[PDB]
Every structure is written in C-alpha cells, then in structure tokens.
C-alpha cells in the first residue's frame, strides 16, 4: 500500500503508471506528454477537474488506486458551462448551508466540471455537502471557487427559465444570462480543503422519513454549548435490526429506535449538532444511504452527499438512565395534557418554570405559582390507579416532550417525587423521554 496505480487519459490514448504515494507527479506528466509528442506546457492535467501542480504527490491529493488523470489541451482557466437556472437553484441552496476574514475560501463553493458533470461543494472544515448536476449542454472541464451566497443570490435573482453561462476570466468568474453580467472574485480550486478518504464500517439504507422521525424525536433534548462536548451532539446507534438516536442535556433525555430491516453490527457514534441540522436539511423522492466510519459519517441522498466529522467522546448509556421500576402509570390524552400545561405555564416562575403535579385516582391537578403570587390550577380526567403523589417539573421540559410526541395518548411512568419520570406514546414504545423532577 506504499505505491499507487494511476491512469492518464486524453480521451483516446491511455497510459498507466505505478508511482510511490510520496513522489511528485511531475515525472508522470512529462512522460505522458512525451508519448503524445506534445510540449509539457501544451497540456493541463486535471484530477476531477482540478489542475494538478507538478510538485504535488498522490498523497497530497488523496488519490486512490486506479484514479484517473485527464490530460486536456491547454486552456488557462478553462472551466465553462451553461445550465438552466432551475437545475442549479436547489443544489446551490443545499451546499450553501455549511467563513472568516482569515478563511475566505470557506465562504466559497468549489465548482468542478468533469466527466459531463458539475459538482458544487460547500464546507466549514468539519462537514461538507456536495451536489452533482448533469451537464446537458456543451461544457469545458476545470475548477474554481466562488463566493457562495453571492453566486446563489445571483442565480435566484434571475428570471424564471433563465440559462446561466459561466466561465473564468483571470481571477474572476463571469456569469452571464440575458443582458445580465456578473464578475465574481475567485480563489484557486487547488486551495479548497477536502476531507481525506476513510473506510465505511457500517452501511445501511433507510427511508428519509425514518431518519427524519429519529432526529425529530430527540433533537430538542440535545445540550446547547455544554462543556461535555459529546452531549451537544446526537448519538446514532446501530443494534440488531434497529437504528437508534439518543440526546440528553443532563436534565432530560430522549431516545428513539426504529427498525431498518437489515441486521447490522453494533456501532455507536456521536454526530455534532451542526451535522444533525444539515442531515435534516437534506431530507426533502428516493431513500437515504448512510455510511458510518470510526471518525466520520456520510449520507447519500439523491444527487447529494453529506459528510461530517464525528464527536470523539463517551456518550452516556440511556439504559442506565431509564427508571428501573416506574410502577405508577398515568395515561392521558396528549393534546388535553399539553394544553393544560401550556396554560399553567403562563403563571409559572419565568426563570425556573416549576409546576406541581398532584396525581390521584383518575385525576391530575396541575398548579403553577410565581413570585407575584399569581396562581394557575388545571384539573384533568386521566387514567391512574396508583398511590397519590405530588411531583414538580420544569414545565418547558414537559411541554417539549408532549410536543415531540405526535400521538393521541401519552403514558407517564412514575416512581416517587425525587426520581425521573419516563414519558412515552401510550401506543408505541419506539420513543421514550426521561425528565428529572424539581424538588418542592
């Protein structure tokens, strides 16, 4: 695994080379030009459209076995394409999701034209989004980077049905449509960062709606800027035939498990908060293919590919957080409970948000008081036959759970006044929520 096999092709002639991963590609380029009877200057060597510099090595470019170097007749800043606005709008919106004065290139999109395809890539150094757009019209291979927001806004601002022609002029990118002309500043494609390749460890396909359910069921329970950096993300776990997400901030936990119809090795990784956000943005036809490595995750959706670094830490075991014997079960309509908590919350303490629950035979009383000595009281019919108890909660955490349960009836599983409560859909164990009480 010290050397690399490479194919160099000019569209008719193909020459193969074995070189050390640490050897500069200069000798390879000059030898190919020599076989063609052409001058070294008369050709440009493109790797996925990006111009290779003679001092770069395969290792520098993360090349892999049987990668292809395309020799093209010299064309300084040669990238050129013409595409329908409608074919660019969603790709541009998607990749512009993931920008400092010291890192201007991170506010740019990488554009690559190669093999009949326009690729657009956005990155923030820790995640990247790539879109592929088929080029139906004539084009010329090459690459550049261009300010993402300005390019998107220009394309969006052009009229419905416009064709957008793009080419390079010195250090600018010229965009033309109708009698509209725009010249944007560029930075070299060779300077755009790219995550090095990695090995997928577990791989599975699942419907977009299933992944969306898993994230929406738990996303609200993630920590915000917790020093326990692992809590700011979402645990993604494979076990048996299920995929599971877990989120917690130390006061509440959410766990959701869904079947994915294929038994898998057990694997457990932490996806960062911004990665969870980007994953959700992609879940707009076809299903979703997920690859999970030891330090990275990748999601393939249609003609998009999202990759994110993982959070390197030890996520808590939700199994240890679930109440051990929550033997007092209350069931109530979800909407009726939510509306009662929402009204009681109006007169709770604005900072601590405590409300008090009194459970008795088939009845729940919710009360709230604030420093002004205002008081709310709500009485509901519920199903409950356990011992009477009084337990306090942060009403925001309770409302967060009830809003995430999109169901007819909920079950609250109680132990005592100082122990966590487990809340689930009365009809489904797919998701579970655990909320610590406040002391009274």
């Amino acid at each position: 695994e010290t050397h690399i096999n490479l194919k160099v092709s000019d569209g008719s002639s193909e020459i193969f080379f074995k070189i050390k991963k640490t050897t500069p590609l200069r000798r390879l380029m000059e030898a190919f030009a020599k076989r063609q009877g052409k001058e070294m200057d008369s050709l440009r060597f493109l790797y996925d459209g990006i111009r290779i510099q003679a001092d770069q090595t395969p290792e520098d470019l993360d090349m892999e076995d049987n990668d292809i170097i395309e020799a093209h007749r010299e064309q300084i800043g040669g990238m050129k394409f013409t595409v329908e606005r409608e074919h660019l709008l969603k790709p541009l919106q998607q990749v512009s999701g993931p920008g400092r004065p010291t890192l201007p290139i991170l506010g740019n999109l990488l554009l690559q034209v190669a093999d009949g395809t326009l690729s657009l890539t956005g990155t923030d150094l820790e995640m990247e989004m790539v879109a592929r757009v088929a080029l139906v019209q004539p084009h010329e291979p090459g690459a550049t980077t261009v300010p993402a927001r300005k390019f998107f806004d220009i394309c969006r601002g052009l009229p419905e049905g416009a064709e957008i022609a793009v080419q390079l002029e010195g250090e600018r990118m010229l965009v033309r449509s109708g009698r509209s002309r725009f010249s944007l500043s560029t930075l070299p494609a060779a300077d755009f960062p790219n995550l090095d390749d990695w090995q997928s460890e577990v791989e599975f396909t699942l419907p977009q709606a299933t992944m969306k359910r898993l994230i929406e069921a738990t996303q609200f329970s993630m920590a915000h800027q917790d020093v326990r950096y692992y809590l700011n993300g979402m645990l993604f776990e494979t076990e048996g035939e299920e995929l599971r997400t877990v989120a917690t901030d130390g006061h509440r936990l959410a766990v959701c498990s869904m079947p994915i119809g294929q038994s898998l090795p057990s694997h457990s990784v932490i996806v960062p908060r911004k990665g969870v956000i980007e994953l959700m943005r992609m879940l707009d036809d076809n299903p979703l293919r997920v690859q999970i490595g030891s330090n990275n995750i990748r999601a393939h959706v249609g003609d998009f590919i999202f990759t994110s670094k993982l959070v390197d830490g030890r996520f808590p075991d939700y199994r240890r957080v679930l109440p051990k014997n929550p033997d007092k079960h209350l069931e109530a309509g979800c909407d009726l409970l939510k509306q009662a908590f929402a009204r009681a919350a109006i007169l709770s303490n604005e900072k601590f948000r405590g409300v008090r629950l009194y459970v008795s035979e088939n009845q729940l009383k919710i009360t709230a008081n604030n420093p002004e000595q205002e008081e709310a009281e709500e009485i509901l019919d519920v199903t409950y036959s356990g011992a009477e108890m009084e337990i306090g909660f942060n009403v925001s955490y309770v409302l967060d759970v009830l809003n995430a349960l999109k169901c007819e009836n909920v079950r609250m599983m109680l132990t005592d006044s100082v122990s966590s409560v487990q809340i689930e859909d009365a009809a489904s164990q797919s998701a579970a929520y655990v909320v610590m009480p406040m002391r009274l």
Binding site: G250, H251, R252, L253, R320, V321, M436, P437, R439
Partner: peptide, 10 residues
C-alpha cells in the same frame, strides 16, 4: 435541580 444519573455529571 437534580440531574439524570449521567456518569459523570449527574
């Protein structure tokens, strides 16, 4: 304001 039994941190 007690926490869930997270190890560490509670």
């Amino acid at each position: 304001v007690p926490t869930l039994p997270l190890v560490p941190x509670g």
